[PDB]
Amino acid sequence: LHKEPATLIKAIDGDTTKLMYKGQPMTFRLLLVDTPEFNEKYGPEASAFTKKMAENAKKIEVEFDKGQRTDKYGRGLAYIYADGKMTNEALVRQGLAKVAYVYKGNNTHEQLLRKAEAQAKKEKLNIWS
Ligand SMILES: Cc1cn([C@H]2C[C@H](OP(=O)(O)O)[C@@H](COP(=O)(O)O)O2)c(=O)[nH]c1=O
Ligand SMILES: [Ca+2]
DSSP: OOEEEEEEEEEEETTEEEEEETTEEEEEEETTEEOOOTTSTTHHHHHHHHHHHHHHOSOEEEEOOSSOSBOTTSOEEEEEEETTEEHHHHHHHTTSOEEOOOOTTSOTTHHHHHHHHHHHHHTTOGGGO
16 A cells, blocks of 8 residues: 555544545545544544644645545545554554444455554553443
8 A cells, every 4th residue: 555645624523534635625534443423422532633643743644445445425535644653543542443344455454453452442441441
């Protein structure tokens, strides 16, 4: 997989963000994770976490997987990096997302994320508390 440039347009919630990619505004949904909706428990904490991570970054990158690049809602499907740190992974490590929506052929980082989830669960963090 390859990292490609993007810039933050606006935070949306724990697992979606609006980025400019190839010069066009796009909503990106984070591959392989599910954060609680803002209305749910830890939803606000997930939103805050992804917003902080994206806003504080000097460099955002998007990395598409091997499969579909947009979902049925027109959202881009990617792994999103903030100064080289994967947001998808960080959310899972902090107990603010669950590994989820693992579709065949867009699942390159599945096992990296499952390892983070195991750690977060061991520490009883957030969702796992
Ligand atoms: C993460 C992801 C979600 N989706 C679709 C499946 C879900 O459909 P439904 O809307 O029919 O439930 C929805 C979940 O996204 P959200 O968790 O953002 O709601 O997005 C994909 O199709 N591919 C993906 O990789
Ligand atoms: Ca969600």
